[PDB]
Write an enzyme that holds these catalytic residues in place. Sequence first.
Site, PDB file in Angstrom:
ATOM      1  CG  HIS A 103      -5.069  -6.413   2.995  1.00 29.55           C
ATOM      2  ND1 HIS A 103      -5.682  -6.095   4.190  1.00 29.55           N
ATOM      3  CD2 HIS A 103      -3.789  -5.979   3.104  1.00 29.55           C
ATOM      4  CE1 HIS A 103      -4.814  -5.498   4.986  1.00 29.55           C
ATOM      5  NE2 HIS A 103      -3.657  -5.419   4.352  1.00 29.55           N
ATOM      6  CG  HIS A 114      -1.305  -1.258   1.799  1.00 29.61           C
ATOM      7  ND1 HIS A 114      -2.284  -2.074   1.270  1.00 29.61           N
ATOM      8  CD2 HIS A 114      -0.846  -1.893   2.900  1.00 29.61           C
ATOM      9  CE1 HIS A 114      -2.407  -3.157   2.017  1.00 29.61           C
ATOM     10  NE2 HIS A 114      -1.540  -3.076   3.011  1.00 29.61           N
TER      11      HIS A 114
END
EC number: 2.7.1.121
Lengths: 356, 356, 294, 294
Positions: free
Chosen positions: A218, A56
């Site tokens: 995710h 991320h």
Amino acid sequence: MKKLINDVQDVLDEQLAGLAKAHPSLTLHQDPVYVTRADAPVAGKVALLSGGGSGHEPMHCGYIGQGMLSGACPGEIFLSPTPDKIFECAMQVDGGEGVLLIIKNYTGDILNFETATELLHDSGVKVTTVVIDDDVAVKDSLYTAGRRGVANTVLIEKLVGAAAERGDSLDACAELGRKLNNQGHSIGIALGACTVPAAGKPSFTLADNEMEFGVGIHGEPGIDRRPFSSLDQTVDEMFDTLLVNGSYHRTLRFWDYQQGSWQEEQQTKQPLQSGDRVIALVNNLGATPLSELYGVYNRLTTRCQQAGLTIERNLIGAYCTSLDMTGFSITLLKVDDETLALWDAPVHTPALNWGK
Amino acid sequence: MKKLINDVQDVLDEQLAGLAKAHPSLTLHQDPVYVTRADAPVAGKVALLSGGGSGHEPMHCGYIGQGMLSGACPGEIFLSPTPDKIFECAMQVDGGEGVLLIIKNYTGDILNFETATELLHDSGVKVTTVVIDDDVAVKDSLYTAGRRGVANTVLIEKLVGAAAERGDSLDACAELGRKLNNQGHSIGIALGACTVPAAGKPSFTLADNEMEFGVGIHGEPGIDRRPFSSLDQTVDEMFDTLLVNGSYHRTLRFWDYQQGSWQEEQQTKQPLQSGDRVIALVNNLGATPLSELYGVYNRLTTRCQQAGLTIERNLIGAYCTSLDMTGFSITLLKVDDETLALWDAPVHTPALNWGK
Amino acid sequence: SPLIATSWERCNKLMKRETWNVPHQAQGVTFASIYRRKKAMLTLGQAALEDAWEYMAPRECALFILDETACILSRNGDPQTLQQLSALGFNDGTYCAEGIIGTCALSLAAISGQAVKTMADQHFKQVLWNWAFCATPLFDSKGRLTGTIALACPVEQTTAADLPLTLAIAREVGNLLLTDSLLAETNRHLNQLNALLESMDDGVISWDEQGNLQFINAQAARVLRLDATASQGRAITELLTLPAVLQQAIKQAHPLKHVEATFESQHQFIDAVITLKPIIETQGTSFILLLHPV
Amino acid sequence: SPLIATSWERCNKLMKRETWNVPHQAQGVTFASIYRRKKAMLTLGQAALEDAWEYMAPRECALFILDETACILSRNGDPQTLQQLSALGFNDGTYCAEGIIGTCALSLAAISGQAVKTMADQHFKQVLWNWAFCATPLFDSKGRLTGTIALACPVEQTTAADLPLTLAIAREVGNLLLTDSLLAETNRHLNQLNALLESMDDGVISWDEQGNLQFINAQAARVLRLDATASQGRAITELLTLPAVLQQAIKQAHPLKHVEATFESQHQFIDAVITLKPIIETQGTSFILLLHPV
């Protein structure tokens, strides 16, 4: 098969090597990996600290420096890092006014960071915690118990980052932390899944013109799948879902360090309502052209105003990503003037850099 | 299809209205469209102007503010704007100290900006042109006679941006960026085509694990197609090209406002050699994970070292994009000391924002 | 065509064939400057296109002059055709670039550097499939594209003369620009050189090896009470009556330096002090007379 | 039509509609001098015709340049069509006068003073009923007929563009000769004026509103020791070192009557007595400088 990588094991090592060389204001530790300010421990200030899986970027390593995180612990791609890391990083940073660990709401994250806190406390480190649960989309997901922690974590690490800088005390920082957590609301959609390098394969596949509504960072399932109709009505239902799913009573836990144990704290989120003032983050999940983000932001300001929300500040771009996902999230954080005061305060990190 | 868009003919308006609402320090003109600093004309200093096709954001409007561009002219996606737009925008920003047209080397851009130069001048505006041709990869391309104008435009925009801010005269400004243009070298690759929303289909298509080597930012063919072996072969053979093709002789054309005609000027590029100092811009073309850019940056430094080039400064991220293409370009801009001084100088634009 | 082929590889990347947006048009006040910048091309062109149309009417087609960016500067020809073209957005100040309206003669001639005809489904955009457009580019004194002449007519009606018609007019207008401006220059270099002689101290008069007046300046005009205009090319000896000193100096080809001398202009006597100089040549010997102002 | 019928009244009296005599062609040698006579027109006209044809081919037709007596000076276009017309006797040197080939644009254009088209049985001679001819006459510096441009094609294939095409070419050639010869005459006038300044008495120099030499004579060049041509168009303050009187005069645009001053050319001080006169024009003030011989 289209990632810019080398050996599928060497991904993080090469990227983190490059991140270190990109930024001499950063330090890469080997055996274990964690990243700190090159000038740590910073004597005098609450050392602030965070982490989670890689994938991320720029969250969390991207936000290390003055006004923000003292250091970060990246795990493998999409894995929480392990206690040993968090411990040691938290000890490299410790300035002398304790250590505040911000934590996203994921089973892995929660478990490892919690064990890390106790480990630190057992060494006589003053330390305490803030848990982020902004994502309004579903409850108890595929890696989370309750609401997932997404983009609002960047806002918080900034605002809290700044209190830390100013010289606020550990409990002040922590309650800024937890106040702000009951005030940000996030939602995310995907038109294309991310692919974790090691897997080889996308991590959910979507039919034509379908979106994952309320996707997690995710690659988790969201509220549903549904026809992508237009940018306009995507933002509309996102915005509606933010309001609708705003209201939220639930139990968190923080580390009471006086009594050395986890303290339940039941707490509440109010819906954003006519009259509120927000910071707005239109955030790219990985591979959405910056240009379409401005189309998103466009509709967003129209929706806000239709419901009496005043955008005070915004950020538009890639702040809390999901590898190569195609999609974006909208965070809205309620503020008052102290909050804005904290926002406009300097920050000097590779991913956020305004200020004297 | 993965386009965050409504109606195919509104995408640009929608997106510009978003950039307007998000940036009150900017002004959106209509009929025709163009973008300026909300505080222009700025009495006192050389006005800095650029433009070209939409679809490269943040370039160019993301570079409008103190330290950089006075205004921008966006055209359709991948279409240079018509000279009426360039003209009026340049009149909107007239400092009383001349106007600098930074022009990317493309057929439609050279032609449109060149005509706007002549319009301005017949109206008694001092005006001159810097022309950017950094892309070392192809001579003559789908849309360009000579070498194409890519990511080095952003470096040059900002270095010349800063000399303007200082106070430097129209002439030093123009000479600066003209010197710069002979010092920057750039080469890009694509593992996936961009799609322009109006065409609805990819601007090109590769086979599996095949890449367009030396692509351009409107999806123009490269040197060839070639299997993508690894990030390391890819960065290596990009870097060899910047060496092998650094050395180049061409004729560029700047506007002599004193003589009221196009003085044609021959000039040579010098390939980067040992002991050179450089600014490095690892640049996302639209859909490469920020993570991956660092891995490239990692490999980039290993090459700058064995070749004897000393990187003084870097930028990593989406600076000069091609809608949703998956790849990256590298720019190396050979520098000296006054250059760096101008690099470090402040800058306050939606996409570059540092200094006091 | 190979030309049309490339046009299409360019268009295809960024635009579809069934779509059509009213092409961008330059707004009023700024079209003003766009037009003004080409007084010289437009006034050659519209004389040329009025004549073309004069000897073509009746017929359904339209004539355009565009500048280097494919902006429509003016249009003429068949009223109904112009309006049908208008009905697709083709107007004064409309931009006709390939990027705006796809593959067309209007942009393609300038792109390729030579007269070009496009018709029917050679056009990228479908909306133009029942048209034929011919256009020819024109260049400037230096060598720079400076405008286009185009002809538009319903496709079923194109003829083989249409292309060369636009090229013939492109050549007139183009070549008049170049040579009109060579004239301009050499004319300015006259006013310049004349104002020099207008600015002497001396009166100056020159004349032919056939005794005709070539030049006279305000000064010398006043002194000899001649009227500058009505004097030119008229024989000097019918203009004024000349001292034996002059006569013999003229006849003998011999310079006189600061010699005193008396002229007679239409009955009146004028005393003057003059230098006289032979100007030797193949055609014969000319003269300057300087009338020095005592 | 009035103009055809008047022509037929002329031909009815001399010639039957169905006999055809191959018209007269000038012998090779005397054609040399006819052709040569017209070289100004031909050099321009043949260029316009190579171009018309390149952008028209393939088409069955022919183009012609004729002179004022309708003599064919040169021809081009479709090989085969040329052969066809050649068989009738349209060759280099052939006269196409009305009394020889009957009513035809080859001669009517000139007779009517304008662009004309004859086709099919508008022609007096039946041989010509399968042809269409377009011709446009073209006039002279001072307005006498000077040549004709013409297009012949098989009658069933004439197009609306054909006459205006001949009209467009006549306009290029015709207008280019006009302004070509204005340019000659204005250039002559330029040299007279030069010869006049060149044999002045004082040296004379001018520079312009920007500050750059426009004129210098053989005697300002001697006296201020500058090379005649290499100095042209160069800035005055670089050409040599200006006496501060002169600079102060220029700055204010005051004149100077016989002032004694010093110049420096090339590490050399030169004295002269100078007049400075300003020349106020609507773009700025230029200056003559006169250097008086002592």
